């Protein structure tokens with residue numbers, strides 16, 4: 079009795095909009 | 107993701123500005139050494155200046171030595 083896997087389809091997204099979701103990070 | 111990789115690349119874009127901030131930090135620790143070296147310099151050249159100027163930098167405190175010689179002529 080294997081588990082039921084939900085599907086996650088590939089989607090094409092605008093790069094500039096996905097950058098609004100990246101966590102803040104500072105090196106300097 | 108390409109978005110993540112872009113933010114990591116850009117993290118070090120302002121190298122030149124951060125070096126300038128380093129300049130400020132170090133020069134703020136070093137610049138006070140100018141006061142000791144400045145006091146000694148004036149201390150050394152004080153006796154080579156005219157009498158009139160020596161009485162000005164001290165607000166009339168300094169005066170000629172009184173050792174008992176070279177007094178007024180009757």
Ligand SMILES: CCCCCCCCCCCCCCCCCC(=O)OC[C@H](COP(=O)([O-])OCC(O)COP(=O)([O-])OC[C@@H](COC(=O)CCCCCCCCCCCCCCCCC)OC(=O)CCCCCCCCCCCCCCCCC)OC(=O)CCCCCCCCCCCCCCCCC
Pocket residue numbers: 141145148149150152153163164167168
């Ligand atoms: C718990 C322990 C306790 C223990 C017991 C207590 C211990 C303490 C007891 C101590 C007692 C005293 C002891 C004796 C000491 C004195 C005697 C002495 O030592 O004399 C020396 C002795 C003889 O002395 P002398 O030459 O006859 O003295 C003549 C005088 O100097 C005559 O000098 P002059 O007349 O030519 O010039 C004087 C003039 C000199 O004047 C000047 O030069 C400058 C004057 C103008 C200053 C303008 C300042 C403008 C800015 C003001 C800012 C104000 C701010 C106010 C803020 C207010 C805030 C509310 O000063 C004045 O006119 C008076 C000053 C009045 C004005 C007030 C302002 C003063 C300056 C302040 C500066 C800033 C301070 C604060 C800084 C930090 C904060 C910013 O010499 C010897 O014994 C020589 C022996 C041979 C030595 C050989 C050495 C080695 C040789 C070989 C070398 C090669 C090998 C290398 C070896 C290296 C070895 C290291």
